[PDB]
Design a protein around this ligand. Structure first.
Ligand SMILES: O=C(O)[C@H]1C[C@@H](O)[C@@H](O)[C@@H]([C@H](O)CO)O1
Ligand SMILES: O=C(O)[C@H]1C[C@@H](O)[C@@H](O)[C@@H]([C@H](O)CO)O1
Lengths: 58, 58
């Protein structure tokens, strides 16, 4: 060890960060009167309805 | 490792952000007297009505 033959110095680093996300929301707060389309074998009713409103410009 | 042969340094990044939205609202707070148009087989009434108001300039 007379010289710096044994003198040693070293550093090392490794950092990793990963992220991920997702969202999906929906809301509906109306009331619509529909009409029966047909009666199924079990008695369930197929209902279809439509409502058109022309407030102004569309 | 005498020289910088092993000396290493690196960085990397990847960021992504996506968004989306939509809204649709409507309101109606009137009163209109309508007239029956015809009587359906089940007794339902087809009602049609119209009201015209000329406040001024239109
Ligand atoms: O004993 C040896 O072998 C050495 C001692 C140091 O001086 C070393 O560095 C080398 C030099 O390169 C000679 O020129 O010689
Ligand atoms: O032992 C070798 O092969 C080396 C030592 C370094 O000096 C290196 O860089 C290369 C240089 O390119 C020679 O000119 O030679």
């Amino acid at each position: 060890f007379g010289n710096s033959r044994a003198d040693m110095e070293a550093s090392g680093g490794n950092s990793f960060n990963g992220k991920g996300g997702a969202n999906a929301s929906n809301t509906f707060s109306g009331t619509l009167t529909v009409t029966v389309d047909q009666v199924l074998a079990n008695g369930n009713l197929h209902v279809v309805g439509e409502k058109q409103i022309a407030i102004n410009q569309g």
